[PDB]
Amino acid sequence: HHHHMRVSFMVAMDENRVIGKDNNLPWRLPSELQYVKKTTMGHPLIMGRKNYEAIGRPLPGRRNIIVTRNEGYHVEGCEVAHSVEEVFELCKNEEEIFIFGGAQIYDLFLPYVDKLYITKIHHAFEGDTFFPEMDMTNWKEVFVEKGLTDEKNPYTYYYHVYEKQQ
Amino acid sequence: HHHHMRVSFMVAMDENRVIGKDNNLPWRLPSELQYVKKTTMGHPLIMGRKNYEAIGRPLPGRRNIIVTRNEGYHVEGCEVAHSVEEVFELCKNEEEIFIFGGAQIYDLFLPYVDKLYITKIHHAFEGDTFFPEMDMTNWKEVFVEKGLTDEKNPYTYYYHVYEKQQ
Ligand SMILES: NC(=O)C1=CN([C@@H]2O[C@H](COP(=O)(O)OP(=O)(O)OC[C@H]3O[C@@H](n4cnc5c(N)ncnc54)[C@H](OP(=O)(O)O)[C@@H]3O)[C@@H](O)[C@H]2O)C=CC1
Ligand SMILES: NC(=O)C1=CN([C@@H]2O[C@H](COP(=O)(O)OP(=O)(O)OC[C@H]3O[C@@H](n4cnc5c(N)ncnc54)[C@H](OP(=O)(O)O)[C@@H]3O)[C@@H](O)[C@H]2O)C=CC1
Ligand SMILES: CCc1nc(N)nc(N)c1C#CCc1cc(OC)c(OC)c(OC)c1
Ligand SMILES: CCc1nc(N)nc(N)c1C#CCc1cc(OC)c(OC)c(OC)c1
Q1: Residues B26 and B139 sit within 8 Å (Cβ to Cβ)
Q2: Which sequence ranges are marked TM in the entry (chains A, B) (predicted)?
């Protein structure tokens, strides 16, 4: 609408939409992370404050934008926004931005998502944090591929990309 | 028109519109069945008498409505209707109803379909029962996604959803 960048979600979730456990990731898939790095590289990452602090460091090659209500919050090598609109202001001339989680930030940007890069992990983890439900009416799957399952990547998972039609 | 529920078709068919063989399903896709259960949950299932009897049991979490000309027909845990209009009476205040087959019941409700949930299986099965032809002009595809193909689900198939424009 009023904003001009493509708003993409980047997320990995399990069979029951779990994305987190005890303020961390419930699984380790190095190959899935490499897919994430390659796809997001050169584009802003929009992160909830909690998500960012668990990561602990600016992710290289991308604008790191942290979303917080804390008006005195500052991190070296990162930009801080306090609302959806402030993100939109900081990113006004960007081609595409990646909403990178976690759940509160996914909920925040849900009315604006144009494109969904969702990895689906075929396992039911114990967890406390969930990706929001989405009505996929007027969305089309434009990419799907099986993830690498091996000794280092011990679950079955698929990369999916959906694009909003309206 | 005069009825106020959305009339949805729920069907799985192959390359030649085959839906049945010898009064049963020509394939076993448990993942497709999982999609069907999730999509139809909480909404009425409208089933031809033959379709229902092959299933043999009320499907849980949904109003089971059986269409038959047999005026003395009764099944515990299900409702019986004898015409399209009687189904519309039973479902007058429903949000959406799912025409669940088989072919005679799809034929019956064809003039009233608003929405199509079609699974397309990329294989040509031997069969005797077919989904009726439909002119898709004035229909828009509002969702498409690849189904899961694996050891338990040995065919390639896609979920499609179409909505009628008029
Ligand atoms: N599997 C996956 O794809 C991913 C998993 N995760 C997981 O998710 C979990 C973290 O998610 P979650 O707990 O939801 O936290 P978030 O990352 O969503 O961060 C929540 C914080 O965001 C800020 N915030 C929330 N709403 C607003 C608002 N309206 N305006 C301004 N700031 C706001 C607040 O910061 P403040 O308190 O400073 O005001 C809040 O504490 C972790 O387990 C993490 O590992 C995260 C990303 C991806
Ligand atoms: N792949 C898929 O998506 C699906 C496949 N199927 C398959 O389809 C086949 C069954 O289809 P089909 O043989 O056409 O049978 P139906 O399920 O459509 O049942 C036909 C019965 O419906 C009743 N009926 C038909 N017309 C009317 C009417 N105008 N008024 C009142 N009742 C009516 C009659 O009941 P009565 O004789 O009692 O009077 C008739 O015998 C099976 O092979 C099944 O596995 C079924 C559903 C889905
Ligand atoms: C699970 C991966 C992931 N996959 C996908 N498809 N989208 C995402 N948004 C994320 C994510 C995330 C958050 C996240 C990323 C990380 O590496 C960059 C982390 O370092 C190891 C991390 O440590 C706590 C937490
Ligand atoms: C093939 C599935 C199916 N898929 C879709 N997309 N729509 C449908 N309307 C049906 C259907 C049907 C009929 C049907 C359902 C069943 O499980 C609930 C059955 O039990 C195993 C069954 O056994 C004889 C017959």
Answers
A1: no
A2: none
Could you tell me the resolution of this structure in angstroms? 2.2
Residue ranges per structural domain of chain A: 1-166
Q: Ligand 3: distance of its center to the CA of B124 in Å?
A: 42
How far is residue B142's CA from residue A138's CA, in Å, rounded to a whole number? 4
Q: Is A44 in the pocket of ligand 1 (CB under 6 A)?
A: no
C-alpha distances in Å from residue B126, one per residue of A10, B14, B25, B31, B100: 43, 10, 11, 22, 21
Cβ distance A141 to B141 less than 8 Å, yes or no, reads no
- C-alpha span between A90 and A73 (Å, rounded): 16
> In chain A, whose CA is at the least distance from the CA of B142?
A138
| Min distance A151 CA to chain B CA atoms (Å) | 20
Of all protein residues, the one whose alpha carbon is nearest to atom 16 of ligand 3 is A55
Q: Taking the CB of residue A76, how many other CB atoms lie within 10 A of it?
A: 6
Tell the residue number behind the tokens 């040509």, with chain if given.
Answer: B124
Q: Distance between CA atoms of A125 and A57, rounded to whole angstroms? A: 26
Q: Are B131 and B106 in contact (CB under 8 A)?
A: yes
Q: Using what technique was this structure determined?
A: X-ray
